[PDB]
Design a protein around this ligand. Structure first.
Ligand SMILES: *[C@@H]1O[C@H](CO)[C@@H](O[C@@H]2O[C@H](CO)[C@@H](O[C@@H]3O[C@H](CO)[C@@H](O)[C@H](O[C@H]4O[C@H](CO)[C@@H](O)[C@H](O)[C@@H]4O)[C@@H]3O)[C@H](O)[C@H]2NC(C)=O)[C@H](O)[C@H]1NC(C)=O
Ligand SMILES: *[C@@H]1O[C@H](CO)[C@@H](O)[C@H](O)[C@H]1NC(C)=O
Ligand SMILES: *[C@@H]1O[C@H](CO)[C@@H](O)[C@H](O)[C@H]1NC(C)=O
Ligand SMILES: *[C@@H]1O[C@H](CO)[C@@H](O)[C@H](O)[C@H]1NC(C)=O
Ligand SMILES: *[C@@H]1O[C@H](CO)[C@@H](O)[C@H](O)[C@H]1NC(C)=O
Ligand SMILES: *[C@@H]1O[C@H](CO)[C@@H](O)[C@H](O)[C@H]1NC(C)=O
Ligand SMILES: *[C@@H]1O[C@H](CO)[C@@H](O)[C@H](O)[C@H]1NC(C)=O
Ligand SMILES: [Cl-]
Lengths: 340, 208, 222
């Protein structure tokens, strides 16, 4: 009755003409109003295979976020190695709003409602929708921020867990707040706060889930082995500033006292390695005043150490995969199919 | 892990080579070919799929954990060493070398005492040559005053001669000048398929 | 066309460090990981790790962690590798490789269809040394054997001819062997009519470029 297919999707949101925040504005231009009355039809005795690691929907969102960052996070200068270009450095008011992705006529989206569907394989409970849920294009590394949560219990996602070059995505079933602040009045000294009790508890659970998928071998965490600061650190955009937080403390093996509040040292940078492609971008000096973002950790990105053989141990390090993986962490349960 | 066999493989042009690989984990398995002094070339991946420029002669197959690479109608270019691979892991390798079949030929055996020029330097090398023989298997047996020398020498063998299809082997026993002058009778004993009985070439220290 | 261009080979001493480069071309460098693999003669090939030119993320085999460093220069598409605290165990030919499937959408790292030419690295305490050449003198059916012993040179290789190449038939130049001292040795023999020894003069042409030593050793019956 239907077949798998790619196509051009359109976006839908709740963006308002009166709101002047940049993402909101981009949406009033790109998207249409969210459907007033969604219709989800459960598909009777049906089964479908999904593959989140090969979902064209991820590519389309990618191009939008690249579009979004071109008109909302324009840097003062770009260093592309081959050239150095100057340009206006507009003050940035950016706060991602939920974006719905929808199919045009003759196509449709399929949704997997298996409460522990890990992202690949057949799905039992399948339904049909015209649009994804609202997804926020939050750009970050190591920690996935402000996303949806596992509806059952923690889920380990990977194209193939035995392949060390494949990204691992952890999907928490209970978010944990990460409170990030940079006091006012070195105007780069920033920090983040997390409840050690809540966090470490969530670690026990994820490692216990991780151990489950590695024939019961001891699971240990280590800091990244190398690469750019965007990669070796938790990196994200808060109130137009680029934070870079040291995550050594979150992945503390021994804590798996250790009950109080752990606080990460972060630094704010004006010169950054652009994610959209290649080259360094230069943003303006830090504005004065207290800057504070409180986000919900909803997922983790991990890379497994390779070349083990002997042991007995599996070693995981925070990060990094790829930015498209953030979208995958949200698009996993959807797929486009064409009628006939 | 990945256990690859056999270690070595002596075959003639025209024959078929069967290299084996045992896995325990499974997942896209690949085969590589390395020619003397060159970078390895991908030959097959997914256990059964040929790469670009790889002819029908190369084929792979599978049975459970076991994986085979098969090379039919061997030709000069095919010889080298082959590796199986699973993700980051490789097999120990299998060396496939050329042995053109021919009539059995016994070795000509020569022994060389150390030159005076070398002895002046305070060291001594005794050399035993086994020339132009077939097949390649052969045994060398050093004896110093009837004492068997185990692990005191080094061997080196040529590749099969292009003209007569024979092999040649050189064995070198090295000793201190002082040690060399301790003993008298230096013997080299050669056993081979072409010899109805082992051949012993020898000499006495300091005798023209 | 996809091309991996490697810097040449080198000789290190134990304790030192080594650095290699690998410039990729013919494709979008950021698309997929670069790998570094070592192959030691008669030894199972070793994957050292991979680097993703995007962000410069890395993955090191347990064996090498703390000793190896992989980085890249995205502008020149060049991958770099360093290996510290070298031991003889490190002697090997070092390669960079890239998987076959490498698009923008995705990849598959482990099918190495692309390899650099390789960089041969030997680590030992031997210093470059030219060979002393000793005669292997013939002795009195109709054929006599003779040669030169090329002993205690480093590093490989040495080349041997006879009477300036005029004499090719019967020549057997054996593969060099590595002595327990770190120096190489090899022999070159030739068979001739034992009636030529009286009149025919036989010369050993030894060339060891690494030390610029070129010897013409006359072999004669003793
Ligand atoms: C994770 O998601 C959470 C919510 O799910 C999100 O936290 C929100 O952050 C935004 C932006 O930081 C906050 O909105 C602000 O509200 C205050 C007033 O209380 C304003 O000061 C802020 O800016 C105003 O003034 C600016 C001056 O330049 C203007 O530019 C701007 O337009 C505003 O007028 C801003 O409006 C929002 O309150 C929080 N919500 C919570 C619950 O904290 C967080 O940012 C997300 N994390 C990441 C990394 O995206
Ligand atoms: C197919 O779905 C119909 C609609 O409910 C149901 O009655 C029937 O049992 C299903 N068939 C199978 C084989 O499950
Ligand atoms: C996903 O779930 C099923 C097993 O129930 C199957 O597709 C595969 O083994 C699982 N993959 C992971 C990474 O758990
Ligand atoms: C999260 O999942 C774990 C299993 O991984 C389960 O034990 C725990 O209760 C779940 N938390 C919630 C809030 O459901
Ligand atoms: C964020 O941390 C600041 C500084 O510790 C604290 O005052 C504030 O209450 C925290 N925000 C939340 C939501 O806990
Ligand atoms: C994070 O902090 C740890 C412990 O303070 C320090 O050793 C390490 O250098 C830092 N990591 C990065 C990537 O800056
Ligand atoms: C596979 O290897 C087995 C092991 O000996 C051998 O019998 C069989 O012939 C091989 N298959 C092929 C196609 O070479
Ligand atoms: Cl891969």
């Amino acid at each position: 009755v239907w077949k798998d297919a790619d196509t051009t999707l359109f976006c839908a949101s709740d963006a308002k003409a009166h709101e002047t925040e940049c993402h909101n504005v981009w949406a009033t231009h790109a998207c249409v109003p969210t459907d007033p009355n969604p219709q989800e039809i459960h598909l009777e005795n049906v089964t479908e295979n999904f593959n989140m690691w090969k979902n064209n929907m991820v590519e389309q969102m990618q191009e939008d976020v690249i579009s979004l960052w071109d008109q909302c996070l324009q840097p003062c200068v770009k260093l592309t190695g081959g050239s150095v270009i100057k340009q206006a450095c507009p003050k940035i008011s950016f706060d991602p709003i939920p974006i719905h992705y929808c199919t045009p006529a003759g196509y449709v989206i399929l949704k997997c409602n298996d409460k522990n569907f890990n992202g690949t394989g057949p799905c039992k409970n399948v339904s049909s929708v015209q649009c994804t849920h609202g997804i926020k294009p939050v750009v970050s590394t190591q920690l996935l921020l402000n996303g949806s949560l596992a509806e059952e219990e923690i889920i380990i996602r990977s194209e193939n867990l035995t392949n060390n070059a494949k990204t691992i995505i952890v999907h928490l079933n209970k978010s944990v707040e990460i409170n990030c602040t940079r006091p006012s009045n070195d105007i780069r000294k920033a920090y983040c706060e997390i409840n050690g009790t809540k966090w470490n508890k969530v670690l026990k659970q994820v490692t216990e889930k991780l151990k489950e998928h590695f024939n019961n071998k001891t699971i240990i965490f280590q800091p990244p082995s190398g690469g750019d600061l965007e990669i070796t650190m938790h990196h994200f955009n808060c109130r137009g500033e680029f934070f870079y937080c040291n995550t050594t403390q979150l992945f503390n093996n021994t804590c798996i006292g250790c009950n109080g509040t752990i606080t990460l040292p972060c630094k704010i940078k004006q010169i950054i390695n652009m994610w959209q492609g290649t080259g360094q971008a230069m943003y303006a000096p830090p504005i004065d005043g207290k800057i504070n973002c409180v986000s919900n950790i909803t997922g983790i990105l991990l890379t497994r150490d390779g070349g083990a053989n002997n042991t007995s141990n599996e070693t995981f390090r925070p990060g990094g995969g790829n930015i498209k993986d953030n979208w995958r962490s949200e698009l996993y349960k959807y797929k486009v199919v064409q009628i006939e | 892990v990945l256990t690859q066999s056999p270690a070595t493989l002596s075959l003639s042009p025209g024959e078929t080579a069967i290299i084996s690989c045992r896995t325990s984990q499974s997942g896209s398995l690949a085969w590589y070919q390395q020619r003397p002094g060159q970078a390895p070339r991908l030959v097959i991946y997914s256990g059964s799929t040929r790469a670009a420029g790889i002819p029908d002669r190369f084929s792979g197959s599978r049975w459970g954990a076991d994986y085979n690479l098969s090379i039919s109608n061997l030709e000069s270019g095919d010889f080298g060493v082959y590796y199986c691979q699973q993700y980051e892991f490789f097999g120990q390798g299998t060396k496939v070398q050329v042995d053109i079949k021919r009539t059995v030929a016994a070795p000509s055996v020569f022994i060389f005492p150390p030159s005076d020029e070398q002895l002046k330097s305070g060291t001594a090398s005794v050399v035993c040559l086994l020339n132009n023989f077939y097949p390649r298997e052969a045994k060398v047996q050093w004896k110093v005053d009837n004492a068997l020398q185990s692990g005191n020498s080094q061997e080196s063998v040529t590749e099969q001669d292009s003209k007569d299809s024979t092999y040649s082997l050189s064995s070198t026993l090295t000793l201190s000048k002082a040690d060399y002058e301790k003993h008298k009778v230096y013997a080299c004993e050669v056993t081979h398929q072409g010899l109805s009985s082992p051949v012993t070439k020898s000499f006495n220290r300091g005798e023209c | 066309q996809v091309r991996l261009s490697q810097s040449g080979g080198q000789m290190k001493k134990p304790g030192e460090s080594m650095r290699l480069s690998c410039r990729a071309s013919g494709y979008e460098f950021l698309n997929c990981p670069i790998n570094w693999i070592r192959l030691a003669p008669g030894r199972r090939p070793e994957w050292m790790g991979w680097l993703k030119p995007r962000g410069g993320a890395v993955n090191y085999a347990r064996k090498f962690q703390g000793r190896v460093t992989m980085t890249r220069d995205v502008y020149s598409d060049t991958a770099f590798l360093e290996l510290r605290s070298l031991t003889s165990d490190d002697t090997a030919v070092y390669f960079c490789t890239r998987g076959k499937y490498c698009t923008a959408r995705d990849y598959y790292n482990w099918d190495f269809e692309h390899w650099g030419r390789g960089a041969p690295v030997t680590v030992s305490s031997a210093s470059t040394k030219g060979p002393s050449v000793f005669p292997l003198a013939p002795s009195s059916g109709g054929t006599a054997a003779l040669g030169c012993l090329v002993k205690d040179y480093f590093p490989e290789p040495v080349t041997v001819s006879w009477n300036s190449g005029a004499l090719t038939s019967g020549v057997h130049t054996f593969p060099a062997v590595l002595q327990s001292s770190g120096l190489y040795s090899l022999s070159s023999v030739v068979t001739v009519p034992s009636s030529s020894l009286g009149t025919q003069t036989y010369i050993c042409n030894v060339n060891h470029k690494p030390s610029n030593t070129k010897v013409d050793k006359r072999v004669e019956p003793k």
